């Protein structure tokens, strides 16, 4: 029985590694490669539109990698199209917020953005300081718990595979997939003596919702702005 659970762990971690966007060692190595005060000023001089366009392009890209993640989770493609959409709609952005913590450097409070690391001030042109500060605090809180790759991979699978999502057709098919992931994650946390980390997670719902709202706002108003 153990070997199957350990196989499902390795299956979820494989699915995650292939869809991670960047390798973690790449993000950690690039931490030294930091934006200059001049390169910061370049980003601060851009238009609100141009800076939101870039960030929405990266959010959109990130959501497409989570769909590739879900597609490789055993049982998810067996679900009906409606359920796949309902789960990804309700889960995708929170998996992005969680995946983002890997590209956050707690030492200097800087994030990987378009080839180098910089601080909150890199995003002044979004005129959303409170939102920026919150996504930074969130990434800081997950960074400080030292979530391994395995933990992120299993946790983000459980953010997606949730049978409580309003609008599901095959609830029982989703519960079977969720339960198997809970077994697997529970076995992993026991082995590693990390049972208690999910008590210490900051809440992500409100932040994900705002990030989704901003992405939609830019789709809706594209014709008021250049191509």
């Amino acid at each position: 029985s153990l070997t199957e659970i350990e196989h499902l762990v390795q299956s979820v971690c494989k699915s995650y590694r292939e869809t991670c966007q960047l390798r973690l060692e790449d993000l950690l190595r690039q931490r030294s490669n930091i934006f200059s005060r001049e390169e910061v000023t370049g980003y601060q001089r851009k238009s609100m539109w141009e800076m939101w366009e870039r960030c929405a392009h990266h959010l959109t890209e990130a959501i497409q990698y989570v769909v590739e993640f879900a597609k490789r989770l055993s049982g998810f493609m067996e679900l009906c199209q409606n359920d796949q959409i309902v789960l990804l709609k309700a889960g995708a952005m929170e998996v992005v917020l969680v995946r983002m913590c890997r590209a956050y450097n707690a030492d200097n409070r800087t994030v990987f953005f378009e080839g180098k690391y910089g601080g909150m001030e890199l995003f002044r042109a979004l005129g959303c300081s409170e939102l920026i500060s919150s996504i930074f605090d969130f990434s800081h809180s997950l960074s400080a718990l030292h979530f391994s790759e395995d933990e992120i991979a299993l946790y983000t699978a459980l953010v997606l595979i949730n049978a409580h999502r309003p609008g599901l057709q095959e609830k029982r098919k989703v519960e079977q997939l969720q339960y198997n992931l809970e077994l697997a994650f529970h076995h992993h946390l026991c082995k590693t003596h990390r049972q208690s980390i999910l008590a210490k997670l900051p809440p992500a719902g409100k932040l994900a919702s705002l990030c989704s709202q901003h992405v939609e706002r830019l789709q809706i108003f594209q014709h008021l702005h250049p191509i």
Binding site: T60, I63, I85, K89
Partner: peptide
């Protein structure tokens, strides 16, 4: 729910 994410997600499933 969000239509904008629905659109992104529908595209990526095909």
């Amino acid at each position: 729910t969000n239509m904008g994410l629905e659109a992104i997600i529908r595209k990526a499933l095909m």
